[PDB]
Write a protein that binds this ligand. Sequence first.
Ligand SMILES: [Cl-]
Ligand SMILES: [K+]
Length: 218
Amino acid sequence: MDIVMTQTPVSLAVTPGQSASISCRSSQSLLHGDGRSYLYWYVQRPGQSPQLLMYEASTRVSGVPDRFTGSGSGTDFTLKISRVEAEDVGVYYCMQGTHWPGTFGPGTKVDIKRTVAAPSVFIFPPSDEQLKSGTASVVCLLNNFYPREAKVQWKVDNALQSGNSQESVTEQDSKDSTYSLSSTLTLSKADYEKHKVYACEVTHQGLSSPVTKSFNRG
Ligand SMILES: [Cl-]
Ligand SMILES: [K+]
């Protein structure tokens, strides 16, 4: 009947050394016949493979520091990190393996808190060498911003473009705790020459109004 997995809080910004505490709830009980609650924690990180931290609700994966502690049974489980470091930064997920099929929560963003930083926006036309290949990749860059939440909107001749776009954000910088992001609009050479002005529109909490960076192709 597919157990619904809920997670709270939605987001968590923390001071290096301060403790964190993530909770996870299941729509039905995950207690198994052998007395074990089959629910495991893992953290997602950009450009990395997911790291398993806790399993069987309370048992710690070998190699994970003692800062991590698993708690709960039945329908309520909590993960606690006593001294959050920069390497602990990521989006934390709980997943139940008791009932088929497996199900996981929405996740909780955990990163180091810093002051709000508005992104520096730069747009780049495709190279003449790549257009010689028949492909055009327009790139919009968002540099050193916090928090992660940001929206990139591509516009072609002031018309909204949504297709043929890829987004890629870095990990939280271990030093200044900012993020950097790149969005690439990849078009055919023929489609690329059907428009005059290319622009990306960026929305971020630190900006009063959306910032648009444009260019015109020759
Ligand atoms: Cl498990
Ligand atoms: K910046």
